């Protein structure tokens, strides 16, 4: 378990997990709000 956790903390794996999470969040945000060109909340 220690060695598996150490391997999971290597740079490419952490990078791909972080970027997958970011891409998913961005895609979901763009799906909920389809188009956006200016900031209209104010």
């Amino acid at each position: 378990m220690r060695d598996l956790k150490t391997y999971l903390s290597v740079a490419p794996v952490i990078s791909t997990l972080w970027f997958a999470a970011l891409a998913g969040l961005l895609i979901e945000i763009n799906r909920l709000f389809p188009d956006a060109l200016i900031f209209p909340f104010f």
Binding site: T6, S9, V10, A11, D35, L37, I38, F39, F42
Partner: protein, 152 residues
Amino acid sequence: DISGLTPCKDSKQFAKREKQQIKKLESSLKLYAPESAPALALNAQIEKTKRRFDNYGKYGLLCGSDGLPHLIVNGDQRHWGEFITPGILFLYIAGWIGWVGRSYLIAISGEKKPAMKEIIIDVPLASRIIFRGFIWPVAAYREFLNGDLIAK
């Protein structure tokens, strides 16, 4: 209004462009059966286009002569939401990221071989460091005032 620009609800080329897009979509829509899924998808596309044009008209942008919206980066109070507010948001996010990275680097600099910590990140320390970026402007201002920001 500004630099000879017309409000986007008044302009006629905007409505002309909307008409062309709707006609182009309906040209392909006419092929499939009414009950088929492609017809539903194309109807959803048409509704999305109409909603987008309505929102663009509502938000008060200024289309030019060609009929496309233009952005004003002067700082005029009527057009602060086009550039200035997203700029502030981006600056906040970038400062957060930079502060978190610099804090992690300084934290791991103490050990004997920081290179092995860079190539193999440690998760608990980074998790502790990450949430301190929510208050990055205050910490940066105080560190600048003290004199810990710039190396000597």
